[PDB]
Amino acid sequence: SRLNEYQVIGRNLPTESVPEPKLFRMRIFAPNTVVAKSRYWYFLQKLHKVKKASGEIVSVNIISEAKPTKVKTFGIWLRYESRSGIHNMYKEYRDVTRVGAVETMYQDLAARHRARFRSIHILKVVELEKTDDVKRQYVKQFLTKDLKFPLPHRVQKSKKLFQATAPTTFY
Amino acid sequence: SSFEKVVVIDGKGHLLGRLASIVSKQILNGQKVVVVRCEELNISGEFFRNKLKYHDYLRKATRYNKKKGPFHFRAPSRILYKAIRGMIPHKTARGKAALERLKVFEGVPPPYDKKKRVVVPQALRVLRLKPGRKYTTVGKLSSAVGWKYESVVEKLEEKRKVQSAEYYAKKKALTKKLNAAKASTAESEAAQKLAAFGY
Amino acid sequence: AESHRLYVKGKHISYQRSKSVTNPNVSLIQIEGVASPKDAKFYLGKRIAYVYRAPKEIRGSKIRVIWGKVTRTHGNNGLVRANFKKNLPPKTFGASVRIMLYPSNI
Amino acid sequence: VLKKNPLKNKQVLLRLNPYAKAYAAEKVGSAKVEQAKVKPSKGQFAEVLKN
Amino acid sequence: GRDHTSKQHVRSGHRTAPKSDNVYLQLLVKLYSFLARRTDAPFNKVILKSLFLSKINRPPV
Amino acid sequence: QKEYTEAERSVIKAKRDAKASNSYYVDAQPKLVFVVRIKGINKIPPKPRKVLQLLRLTQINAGVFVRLTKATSELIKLAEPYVAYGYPSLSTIRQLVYKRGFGKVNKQRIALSDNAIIEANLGKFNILSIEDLIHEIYTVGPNFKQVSNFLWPFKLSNPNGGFRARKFQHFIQGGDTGNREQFINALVKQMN
Amino acid sequence: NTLLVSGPFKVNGVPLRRVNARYVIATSTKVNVSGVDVSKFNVEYFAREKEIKAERVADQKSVDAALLSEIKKTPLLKQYLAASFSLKNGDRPHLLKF
RNA sequence: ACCGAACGUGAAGUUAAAGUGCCGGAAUGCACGCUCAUCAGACACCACAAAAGGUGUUAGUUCAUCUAAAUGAACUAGCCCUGAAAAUGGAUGGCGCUCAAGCGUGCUACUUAUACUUCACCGUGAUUGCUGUUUUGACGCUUUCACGAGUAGGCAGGCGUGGAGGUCAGUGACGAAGCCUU
RNA sequence: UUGAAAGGGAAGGGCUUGAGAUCAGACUUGGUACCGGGCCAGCAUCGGUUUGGAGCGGCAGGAUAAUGGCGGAGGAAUGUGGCACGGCUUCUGCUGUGUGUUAUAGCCUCUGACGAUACUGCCAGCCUAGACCGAGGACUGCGGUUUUUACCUAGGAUGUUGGCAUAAUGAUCUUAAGUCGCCCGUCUUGAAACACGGACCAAGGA
Numbered sequence A: 001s002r003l004n005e006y007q008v009i010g011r012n013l014p015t016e017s018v019p020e021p022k023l024f025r026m027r028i029f030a031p032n033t034v035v036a037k038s039r040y041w042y043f044l045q046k047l048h049k050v051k052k053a054s055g056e057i058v059s060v061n062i063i064s065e066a067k068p069t070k071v072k073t074f075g076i077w078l079r080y081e082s083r084s085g086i087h088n089m090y091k092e093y094r095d096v097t098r099v100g101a102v103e104t105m106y107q108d109l110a111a112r113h114r115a116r117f118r119s120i121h122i123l124k125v126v127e128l129e130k131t132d133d134v135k136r137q138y139v140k141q142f143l144t145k146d147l148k149f150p151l152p153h154r155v156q157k158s159k160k161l162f163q164a165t166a167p168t169t170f171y
Numbered sequence B: 001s002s003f004e005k006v007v008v009i010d011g012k013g014h015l016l017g018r019l020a021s022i023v024s025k026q027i028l029n030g031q032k033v034v035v036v037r038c039e040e041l042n043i044s045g046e047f048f049r050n051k052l053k054y055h056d057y058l059r060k061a062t063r064y065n066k067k068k069g070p071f072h073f074r075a076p077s078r079i080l081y082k083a084i085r086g087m088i089p090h091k092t093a094r095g096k097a098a099l100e101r102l103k104v105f106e107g108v109p110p111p112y113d114k115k116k117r118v119v120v121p122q123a124l125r126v127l128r129l130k131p132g133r134k135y136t137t138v139g140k141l142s143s144a145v146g147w148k149y150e151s152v153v154e155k156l157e158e159k160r161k162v163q164s165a166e167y168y169a170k171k172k173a174l175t176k177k178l179n180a181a182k183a184s185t186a187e188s189e190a191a192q193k194l195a196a197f198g199y
Numbered sequence C: 001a002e003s004h005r006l007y008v009k010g011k012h013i014s015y016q017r018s019k020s021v022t023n024p025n026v027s028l029i030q031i032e033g034v035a036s037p038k039d040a041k042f043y044l045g046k047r048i049a050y051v052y053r054a055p056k057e058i059r060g061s062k063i064r065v066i067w068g069k070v071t072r073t074h075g076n077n078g079l080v081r082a083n084f085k086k087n088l089p090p091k092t093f094g095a096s097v098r099i100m101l102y103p104s105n106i
Numbered sequence D: 001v002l003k004k005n006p007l008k009n010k011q012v013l014l015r016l017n018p019y020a021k022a023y024a025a026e027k028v029g030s031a032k033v034e035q036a037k038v039k040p041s042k043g044q045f046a047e048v049l050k051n
Numbered sequence E: 001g002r003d004h005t006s007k008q009h010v011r012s013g014h015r016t017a018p019k020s021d022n023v024y025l026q027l028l029v030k031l032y033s034f035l036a037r038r039t040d041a042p043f044n045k046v047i048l049k050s051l052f053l054s055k056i057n058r059p060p061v
Numbered sequence F: 001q002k003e004y005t006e007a008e009r010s011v012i013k014a015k016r017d018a019k020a021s022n023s024y025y026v027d028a029q030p031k032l033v034f035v036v037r038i039k040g041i042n043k044i045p046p047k048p049r050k051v052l053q054l055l056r057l058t059q060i061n062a063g064v065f066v067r068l069t070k071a072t073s074e075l076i077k078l079a080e081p082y083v084a085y086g087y088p089s090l091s092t093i094r095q096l097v098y099k100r101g102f103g104k105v106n107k108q109r110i111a112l113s114d115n116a117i118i119e120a121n122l123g124k125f126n127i128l129s130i131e132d133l134i135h136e137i138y139t140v141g142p143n144f145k146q147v148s149n150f151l152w153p154f155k156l157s158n159p160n161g162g163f164r165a166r167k168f169q170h171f172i173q174g175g176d177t178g179n180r181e182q183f184i185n186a187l188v189k190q191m192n
Numbered sequence G: 001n002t003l004l005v006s007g008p009f010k011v012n013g014v015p016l017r018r019v020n021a022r023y024v025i026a027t028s029t030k031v032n033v034s035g036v037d038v039s040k041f042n043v044e045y046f047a048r049e050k051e052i053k054a055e056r057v058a059d060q061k062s063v064d065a066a067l068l069s070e071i072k073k074t075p076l077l078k079q080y081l082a083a084s085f086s087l088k089n090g091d092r093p094h095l096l097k098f
Numbered sequence H: 001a002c003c004g005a006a007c008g009u010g011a012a013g014u015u016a017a018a019g020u021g022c023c024g025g026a027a028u029g030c031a032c033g034c035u036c037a038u039c040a041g042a043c044a045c046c047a048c049a050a051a052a053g054g055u056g057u058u059a060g061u062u063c064a065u066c067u068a069a070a071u072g073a074a075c076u077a078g079c080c081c082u083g084a085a086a087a088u089g090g091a092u093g094g095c096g097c098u099c100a101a102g103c104g105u106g107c108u109a110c111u112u113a114u115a116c117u118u119c120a121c122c123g124u125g126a127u128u129g130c131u132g133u134u135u136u137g138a139c140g141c142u143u144u145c146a147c148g149a150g151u152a153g154g155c156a157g158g159c160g161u162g163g164a165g166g167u168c169a170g171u172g173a174c175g176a177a178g179c180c181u182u
Numbered sequence I: 001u002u003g004a005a006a007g008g009g010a011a012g013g014g015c016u017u018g019a020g021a022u023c024a025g026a027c028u029u030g031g032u033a034c035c036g037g038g039c040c041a042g043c044a045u046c047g048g049u050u051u052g053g054a055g056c057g058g059c060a061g062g063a064u065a066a067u068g069g070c071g072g073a074g075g076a077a078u079g080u081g082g083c084a085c086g087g088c089u090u091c092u093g094c095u096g097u098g099u100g101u102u103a104u105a106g107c108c109u110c111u112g113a114c115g116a117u118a119c120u121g122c123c124a125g126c127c128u129a130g131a132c133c134g135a136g137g138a139c140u141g142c143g144g145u146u147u148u149u150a151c152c153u154a155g156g157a158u159g160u161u162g163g164c165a166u167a168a169u170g171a172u173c174u175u176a177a178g179u180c181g182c183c184c185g186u187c188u189u190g191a192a193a194c195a196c197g198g199a200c201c202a203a204g205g206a
């Protein structure tokens, strides 16, 4: 809900040399369309020697999840910048949408590597379709036969300040 | 959430600072509070660390005259009192009047041994701390820094618990008899008609 | 019976204030049993009475009242703001007030 | 002597904009649009999903 | 606040009345103020401003 | 009204037909912005200070309509860390003009409470009513200069609901300044 | 703008009189009053003139008769009308239905 | 001297920066992780820390060995530990806080400046009209809009004291002037 | 000296209210039992500003949402039934391992025709809860409704009722409480300064 996946399609402005410049597409994870077009131009100015002023955005479209109530495992490839250098890394997430997995990834890199949103490039997000593709044991352990587990030590949230009965944590 | 005449909190298993903040706001808003069993309070962190903290507190004293310095009270109820007074504007008349609404005790002295005691879930150790974290019992910490009455309080609490258990056995027997009597009068006209009302 | 109350119990908590500056013209009131702005909105516009006792009889009575009304909710925990004909004196921080059930819309 | 908001005051609304009567009478604000059911994206535009 | 684009509370810088206390000059100012207000002939307005002028601004002719 | 409805429907039909014909429809670029000053009046460097003055934005929460060209785009570029702007909808323009619309009549801020006030000052540009003025603003028309300058700068309130946590950074980085491009309408609903 | 109410005076001790709608809680309990004649009670009927006019006492008897005819049809309604309302401990008027 | 915002006298609303466990107005609010310290840590300016170490724990990178039940090497960078010694007792502001009330990050609501919005009133500047009704104030009356920080300093309009010309055929021993006084 | 009041390591000040004291005012220069007025309040309706509700409803867009449900084809495994091999259960969820593809569970992919919902926006649509304000003072304007040289919500608050006038009400003084408040003058980039003058008062003093 923090993010949406967009396609952004753009091209160079037509000139006399090139009447039909080549259309390019990027898949962008952004809070809204303004940021989506900003990110598109950011990556186009890195990858190619183009500017925003000599180009134009052709289309911006939400890409909805195909199966929003199917449980999936995603692999995400990332380029991020640390305090010290620049690194590549690959992590796995379980979710029902690509946007949910991307949001969890942003939280996770903020938590473990102190990587802010500006420091991260999303190389690729892929639904892992075979259980053999799942490489990380922190997600693999939820892919075993007849998984069941309790939730020991339940803490009930109280509306009142003072309770007349002793606490329990059974569940 | 209701306005009570006096709220009597059982201090056993409550974290010092969380209970202190809740009590401070209660007394500032005009509610009389009594906290009992202050030796059963808890502080998060291992015992040795809280002992070190108390010794760092002891180190502070007026150089030119120790009699003017901070007064380091050792009893557990006074440790809770120090935590509470730090959360009160105690140098104003309103703060003093708020602190007059508070009472704190080791053990459960009369008349509070025959009165209902409540708990504060937002401050309960078993509900707040992560299950593997170490904690301190304020009664042990007080005894380590000069409180003299751990064993007296323990003996008196044992006696109170014997008396209270006998009280409870009688109340349980009476309640069983009353439940039998109300079961004898079920499926009555009044019983059915009350059942139609959710009662 | 033995209970004759027709008002809701309340407390005078504070003035409207920032950290260092208070505004005596607005009082913050806690209504008993009210924990959310949704519950507190039932009481908007209800009249409030602060009833106190004074040394000197007026019309043969030593009971005096300051009348006000609930104006809006305060915060997220069901407190309300109130406006009194005369500002409630700050010694009554912690004192009880009476939230009437009128003007009624039930 | 006193400014009145036409979005609140119906009379002032009519004074400034006589058409507001016809707009309401014709239910312009909630007009049905007549059209059929088409899916112009059922072909190549489905490169929105994957390349 | 305001980011002012001109100096605030500036007087017009033009004389709006004779500095003189001669009552008959005031009678003439009264007549020509009426004339400049009710007639819209440019001449009357010019005459009205002239009646306000100081001595060095009315050189002898 | 009829031409507003036909312009909306024609764009919708074009976008649909482009999908079917394996093409992409590209909207006409916006011709109009609404610019709101959201920075106070202290500690402004001289060049953006002058630009804000030339935009008639001399207080906080003041707003004006601007016709987009290269000249005015570079003007707004100079004022970017002090303003929030974007493309106003027709209903946004209507609401602004109806509630907080004032005319400059002999250097005076005069409420637009009657069509006579508009006809007396702009009727020579064939603007006879408040709806004529709204039409001229929304469709960036031939007499946009005169109509936009006749309107006093709009004096908005602070937003009901507040800004984002910190204002003075671009909308893209999570602040409130710069071009937000259709979310100017939500901000105007908050502030108007 | 005022409301005409009766106890009935026999059940409660409160007579035909005016009350203001803002000082009333309207419950969900209803009495069928198609059989009471109230066609001659108006503002002039309570115009200011202890001792009570025989008009007022006669009207009170007349209205009480029809009301008690109708009130007795609902069990416990008469006893409910005879009892005073009060707020008990734990009673929240924003949560309570009347 | 930083951030926000610049100030006539008020009512109501909303905010900025900053915050919402208590001191203190506002959540022991919703959420994903990380961290346990016998010198934890805690908010720009700002009230400091390095070279260098750790088999504490977490996530990554690249190789390699394994049914012919996983393991071996090298490394990267997060929090934590060591490196880290001063003189009165003492300072994340204090209390205190450990699935935090700490650190990274997202969200929902909420709190309140002399700032913004609407309205009242004072003043300043401008502005509308006023003679067969101009009426003994036209230096007047009247319509409308905008604005109001200030040392040195400039100017304007007023308040107060001794004495002088004129006027009130002014007050006063039936009490002038002075002095004391919720 | 007398009276009153306050007083835990200064006092004094601002703002606010309470308490006690003082002061003031409309039953008017009231008019002739009535008329009518003054002050403090309740309610109703209106106008201006504004914050709300689990608000309700209509319309539009998008992949003319994506899903789901239904129908059709294809596939595999964290392989259901069946079957076989077993260490333990008197196959008393026994159990584990293999096989293969709906069987005595299901799942995934693609797709066909209908139907929704979410999100975003529009409504000169509807209902509903509170707060603050009432400037002006014959008429004149713009509009509306027309049933009318009429009436209106349309160039700024009226209607009604109760109480009080031996007073509900307002101001000041004293004091309490809450909150904030360093000692002025001066030279100075910078003064509360551990910088200088100043114990107090009158009269004189540039």
Ligand SMILES: CN[C@@H]1[C@@H](O)[C@@H](O[C@@H]2[C@@H](O)[C@H](O[C@H]3O[C@H]([C@@H](C)O)[C@@H](O)[C@H](O)[C@H]3N)[C@@H](N)C[C@H]2N)OC[C@]1(C)O
Binding pocket: H039, H084
């Ligand atoms: C992430 N950057 C860190 C920065 O946060 C900080 O690190 C402190 C570190 O200095 C502290 O550690 C240091 O300081 C503490 C104490 C004096 O604070 C000492 O007890 C300790 O021995 C000493 N190593 C450590 N306990 C916490 C880190 N966040 O100091 C600079 C740094 C090391 O680069």
